[PDB]
Amino acid sequence: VMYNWTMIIARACFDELQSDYLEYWLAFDYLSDVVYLLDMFVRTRTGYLEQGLLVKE
Amino acid sequence: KYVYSLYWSTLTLTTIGETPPPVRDSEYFFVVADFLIGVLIFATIVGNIGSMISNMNAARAEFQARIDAIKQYMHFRNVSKDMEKRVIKWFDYLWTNKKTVDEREVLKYLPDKLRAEIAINVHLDTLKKVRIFADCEAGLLVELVLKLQPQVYSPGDYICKKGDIGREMYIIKEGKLAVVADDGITQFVVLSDGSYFGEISILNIKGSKAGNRRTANIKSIGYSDLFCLS
Amino acid sequence: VVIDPSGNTYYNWLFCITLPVMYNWTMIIARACFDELQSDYLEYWLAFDYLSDVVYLLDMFVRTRTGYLEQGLLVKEERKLIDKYKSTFQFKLDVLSVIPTDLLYIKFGWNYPEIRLNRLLRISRMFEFFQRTETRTNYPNIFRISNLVMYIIIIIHWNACVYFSISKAIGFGNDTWVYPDVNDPDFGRLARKYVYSLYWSTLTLTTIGETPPPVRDSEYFFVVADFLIGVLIFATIVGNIGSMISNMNAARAEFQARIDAIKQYMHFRNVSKDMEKRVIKWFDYLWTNKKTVDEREVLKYLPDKLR
Amino acid sequence: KYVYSLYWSTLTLTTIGETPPPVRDSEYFFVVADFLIGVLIFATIVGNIGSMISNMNAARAEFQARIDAIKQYMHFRNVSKDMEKRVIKWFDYLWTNKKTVDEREVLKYLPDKLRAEIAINVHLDTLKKVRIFADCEAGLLVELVLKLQPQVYSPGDYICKKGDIGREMYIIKEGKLAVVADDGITQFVVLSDGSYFGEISILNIKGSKAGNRRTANIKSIGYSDLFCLS
Amino acid sequence: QSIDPLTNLMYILWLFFVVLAWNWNCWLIPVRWAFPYQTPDNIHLWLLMDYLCDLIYLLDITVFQMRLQFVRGGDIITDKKEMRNNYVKSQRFKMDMLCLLPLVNPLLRLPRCLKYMAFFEFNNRLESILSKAYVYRVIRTTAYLLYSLHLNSCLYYWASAYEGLGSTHWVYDGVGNSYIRCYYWAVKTLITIGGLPDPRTLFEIVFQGLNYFTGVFAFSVMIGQMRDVVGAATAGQTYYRSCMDSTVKYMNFYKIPRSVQNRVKTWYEYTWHSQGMLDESELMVQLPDKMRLDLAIDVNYSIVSKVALFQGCDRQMIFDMLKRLRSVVYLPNDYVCKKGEIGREMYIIQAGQVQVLGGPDGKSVLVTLKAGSVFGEISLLAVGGGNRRTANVVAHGFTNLFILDKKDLNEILVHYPESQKLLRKKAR
Structure with missing residues (x-):
């Protein structure tokens, strides 16, 4: 999220940064989406306290 | 750029x-x-x-x-x-x-179970060493541990003098008391930490000799930091 | 032989050790970033550095003979005091600040005073003074505003030294942002600079x-x-x-x-x-x-014996 | 220049x-x-x-x-x-x-003499209008004024109901109470400022018929700042 | 149909429209006076909004504003009769009846916009309803500063128009949108109105310090509102944190073992969440006594009222017990009741579940009780050390019990003999 916040407007405005470091941007960009999917997985694997029982279903 | x-x-x-x-x-x-x-x-x-x-x-x-x-x-x-x-x-x-900060307002929020646990962790062995409280139930000893009250003294302070009314039991936690004469000199004994005094006068006894009256002037050598049970 | 860490000798010794710590923190960067101070007043800051080093050693000795209270009684045993000293990060910091680094003068020349940059670690002692004084002063507000002003002065002085060092690195006169020049009749005087x-x-x-x-x-x-x-x-x-x-x-x-x-x-x-x-x-x-103020609430704060 | x-x-x-x-x-x-x-x-x-x-x-x-x-x-x-x-x-x-801010906390800062004088000033004429304290010593009335306690209420709140212990007297300083039946819909007597209803109950008369038991439901129709004597 | 000035949910939303209209007037009158934006292509559309503003101002004089319940001597007046004449004699009608009389031009509506109290009332309603109301004060002062800059720019444009476009150094032109030009000028002069080599005259240098002081005052108000908002937001967090490390420092001083340290830290964290307060008595003591009684009889009254032990007693008894109920949170796998213990208290369940660990050799669940279940009431009528517990009771998870000690019951019983005789008869 930090990368997607301070390293997206720096390429949408500085057209030379992207044109130079496109390969690194692509690698980190795909990694970001992979971690975003894993975010859905983890959020689906978090419990919540029901009467203090910590549901594990 | x-x-x-x-x-x-x-x-x-x-x-x-x-x-x-x-x-x-x-x-x-x-x-x-x-x-x-x-x-x-x-x-x-x-x-x-x-x-x-x-x-x-x-x-x-x-x-x-x-x-x-x-x-x-x-x-x-x-x-x-x-x-x-x-x-x-x-x-x-x-x-x-x-x-x-004082110990009574530090633990004023904890529930009685956690207060009992921490209190029996701090001082339960010393209370079990007390002659009267030696072979008594664990519930009573837990009841007697939550009722202790901190009292911190200064060097030269007199915890009690001869003839004073005694209605407390004092257990030395981290300190060094001394039994002095009425003149304040000629040290008799030195009570290190873990010891106690006034345990027989804390409970009323039929026909006690020195009824609710201290029989020895004892003072602090340095700082005392001892606990009292009324 | 042991001094009470709450008495009066400890406080004046805190002042005595606060002096050279501030001297180092203020002069080391200045006479390293300018090189005209270092060149002119050589013997002044040979004697001053020797005095600072011996005061640091005396501070080490005092901290070995400071003392603490055990069972409410202040300890008066040399071995226990030495072992208590050799257990805190302060001992490591002091040893780091006391190592002889002047031997690099023959290796780096007399134009490098930055080698005595390890002395900038006893500052905690200085801090301790500015705490103890705050307890012993009559009007704390004046002292604290003076301390804040001094901190601002130190920071501004450090920034000026850094700016001059950057200007020297880039070159005097290479542009309008740099320091003007070292060949002017006034700008090359070490006061104007x-x-x-x-x-x-x-x-x-x-x-x-x-x-x-x-x-x-x-x-x-x-x-x-x-x-x-x-x-x-x-x-x-x-x-x-x-x-x-x-x-x-x-x-x-x-x-x-x-x-x-x-x-x-x-x-x-x-x-x-x-x-x-x-x-x-x-x-x-x-x-x-x-x-x-109410007498009862005032007396509530005190312990029962003092009350 | x-x-x-x-x-x-x-x-x-x-x-x-x-x-x-x-x-x-x-x-x-x-x-x-x-x-x-x-x-x-x-x-x-x-x-x-x-x-x-x-x-x-x-x-x-x-x-x-x-x-x-x-x-x-x-x-x-x-x-x-x-x-x-x-x-x-x-x-x-x-x-x-x-x-x-509750009145006790507000007046806690004043000295005892000034607090007593203010208490006499605010509600002592009303305490002289109650039937029981008509012919009474002023010295006792001063302490009785000092013993009054404030009670604030809300619309629909019930003061005494019926068949309660009835150990207090209420003096209506501000607001308007009402006497209602067992079902709080029908109204008989709507009291106003200065009135009182618990005068006899506090003084437990020997042989009193239906002693210490409220005989009517009293509910607050407004906010009804009252004063209670126990 | 008398309406409630507070919590009506429609009066506040209509006050929103009225304050919006008042803001429209207060912000558009200077612009219409200074800038020639009242072109024939926009005069009709501006005057339509002027008609709607006049209509909504009329709605704020009569009709809806006519009805408003109030309080006199504690009594709420809501009969739609008596405050018909109370409003006309009130200050609200006084600041009106001159803010609506017929009289574009600067002085045309300056006396016709004076309802500074309607906006304050809307403020009060907003802070009454909105939870995060602290930032509203700072956005209010931000609007104040922006309005100050707006007026300072409108005055600059008027001065430029009266002096001529292209006459002196400080004037501007109208090639572009002059509003933002004048706003920029006002902002620039809010901090930059000096200069030794530019002695304009004896009427501009003298007030430069005045405008700098106004800016510094507004800026200090800004900083103060920020500091107050931050303190109000972080007060609870700071208090909870301070209590936590004070307890931690105490226990580290006394060399408390790691396990009980973890348990007390867990209690602190779990109670900070879902409560927001470390204890509830400190809040209740500040409360009015009747409010506390109503809270007790609305939280856990029906649970104790159906207890078979206290059947047939009066209401003051059970009310006082409810007032003396003490809340407590138990950690998972905590022995609420131990076998062979005095068991003097009487616990009720309000959130969670507990289990009676019985079986052949223990460690076997016999029955679990849920929210609304009481247990141990038979001990409340016992004597000193005569109710040794029968079995073990353990909390399944994070349970919320309501303890009522036997000593409190004795103290309450001291004042009730007719219930004391019944309780002793049940015990016998």
Whole structure:
């Protein structure tokens, strides 16, 4: 999220940064989406306290 | 291309006269919005360290308030200078070795189970060593542990003198008491930590010899920090 | 032989060790970043450095003979004191600050005083002084404002030294943002240099832009960094001043709030105006004669024996 | 010669930097000191104004803290929505009419003599209108006035119901009570300020028919600040 | 149909429209006076909004504003009769009846916009309803500063028009949108009105300090409002944190073992969440006594009222017990009741579940009780050390019990003999 916040407007405005470091941007960009999917997985694997029982279903 | 723009953004947020005039109309909007936005964040951050700084030095503020109130009280009451230096030294000791907060308001929120657990952790062996409380139930010993009260003394302070009314039992936690004569000299015995006195007088006994009356003057060599059961 | 860490000898020794620590923190960067101070006054800061080193050693010895209270009784055994000293991060810091680094003078030349940059670690001792003094002073607000002002002075001096070092690295006269030149009749005098550096650093840490604009990328970044540092500094200053004023006015504010509570109650319930005057006069009598605090609550703070 | 100097002073100490730059090695640190003094000055105004605005806006802060705490408590314990509305209305009524702080806490700061005089001033004529205390010693009436306790209520609140222990007397200072049947819909007697109904019950008369038992349901139709003698 | 000035949910939303209209007037009158934006292509559309503003101002004089319940001597007046004449004699009608009389031009509507109290009332309603109301004060002062700059720019445009476009150094032109030009000028002069080599005259240099002081005052108000808002927001967090590390420092001083340290830290964290307060008595003591009684009889009254032990007693008894109920949170796998213990208290369940660990050799669940279940009431009528517990009771998770000690029952019983005889008869 930090990368997607301070390293997206720096390429949408500085057209030379992207044109130079496109390969690194692509690698980190795909990694970001992979971690975003894993975010859905983890959020689906978090419990919540029901009467203090910590549901594990 | 990056650093010049960063410096320009800094100038635009901070000042308004350090950059060439926005000769185009659409640039005036940018500069005005930058000034208002930057003044907003600057007020926010200034308030933030203001609140943090106020929070950092607050225990010192209340401690100084207590000291000032004490000194004013014993200024308008003509209390002698010896007592003045004694209480000043007491507050100095409190601030230097951090002890300003009391044990009773530290644990005032915990439920009785956790208070009982921490209390039997702090002092249960010493209470089990007490002669009267030796072979008694665990529930009673838990009931007697939550009722202890801290009392911290100063060097030379007299815990009790001969002939005083005794209605307390004292257990030395971290200190060194001494049994002195009525003249204050000629040390008789030295009571290190973990020991106790006045255990027979804490409970009424049919036909006791020295009924509710201390029979020995005992004082503190250094600081005492002992617990009392009424 | 052992000195009470709460007595008076300890406090004056805190002053005596605070002197050379501040001397180092102020002069090392200055005479490393200018090289005209270092060249001219060689023997002054040979003697001063020797004095600072011997005072550091004496501080080590004093900390070995300081003492602590065990079972409420202050310890008076040399072995226990030495072992207690050789257990804290302070001992490591002191040893780091006391290693002989002057042997690099033959290796790096007499133009490098930065080698004595390890002495900038006893500052905690200095801090300790500014704590103890705050307890022993008569009016804490004046002392604390003086301490804050001194901190600002130290920071501004460091910024001026850094600016002059950067200017020397880039080159005197290479652009309009750098220091003008070392060949002018006035700008090469080591007084104009230092005072102009102070002026530039003060004008840059405070509201930014008044100084000549930068030319190179490094200068552009340095200006922004100095602006950020100055913003943080000014926020700290205003926070401290606000805390001071609130602490000074808290007692009067609470007494006034009590008065308004009483007055609001007496306006709610229709009370004879004569009794309103009587209670107002009573509160004024309490304030003027410094009897505005309640005896019972005051005595509650004390322990039972002292009470 | 003075206007120009004053203008230079007020532009240098506001740290505008519109003055000609120093050029002679003595104006430099003079301007440095002027900038330092200006920074300290501006810090002084901002701190003083912040402290003033904090002190002037302190009662609202405590009231908001209490209101948020009670709202959070009543949301946490799943109290009824009707009671939520009732409590919110009671709190807003107390803030609107400046009755937020209870009278005992308000008057705690006054000395005993002044507090007694104010208590006699506010409610001692009313305590002389009750039937039982008509022919009574004034010295006892002073203590009885000193023993009155405030009680604030809300619309629909019941004071005594019926068949209760009945160990108090109520003096209606402000508001209007009402006497209702077992089902609180029919009204018989609507009391007003200065009235009282628990006079006989407190003085337990030997042989009294239906002693210490309220014989009528009394409910508050307004907010009815009352005073109770036990 | 008398309406409630507070919590009506429609009066506040209509006050929103009225304050919006008042803001429209207060912000558009200076612009219409200074800038020639009242072109024939926009005069009709501006005057339509003028008609709607007049209509909504009329709605704020009569009709809806006519109805408003108030309080007199504690009694709420909501009969739609008596405050018909109370409003006309009130200050609200006084600041009206001159803010609506017929009289574009600067002085045309300056006396016709004076309702500064309607906006304050809307403020009060907003802080009464909105939870995050602290930031509203700062956005209010932000609007104040922006309005100050707006007026300072409108005055500059008027001065430029009266002096001529292209006459002196400080004037501007009208090639573009002059509003933002004048706003930029006002903002620039708010901090930059000096200069030694530019002695304009004896009427501009003199007030430069005045405008700088106004800016500094507004800026200090900004900083103070930020600091107050931050303190109000972080007060609870700071208090909870301070209590937590004070307890931690105490326990580290006394060398408390790691396990009980973890348990007490867990209690602190779990109670900070879902409560917001470390204890509930400190809040209740500040409360009015009747409010506390109503809270007790609305939280856990029906649970104790159906207890078979206290059947047939009066209501003051059970009310006082409810007032003396003490809340407590138990950690998972915590022995609420131990076998062979005095078991003097009487617990009720309000959130969670508990289990009676029985079986052949223990560690076997026999029955689990849920919210609304009481247990141990038979001990409340016992004597000193005569109710040794029968079995073990363990909390399944984070349970919320309401303890009522036997000593409190004895103290309450001291004042009730007719219930004491019944309780002793049940015990016998």
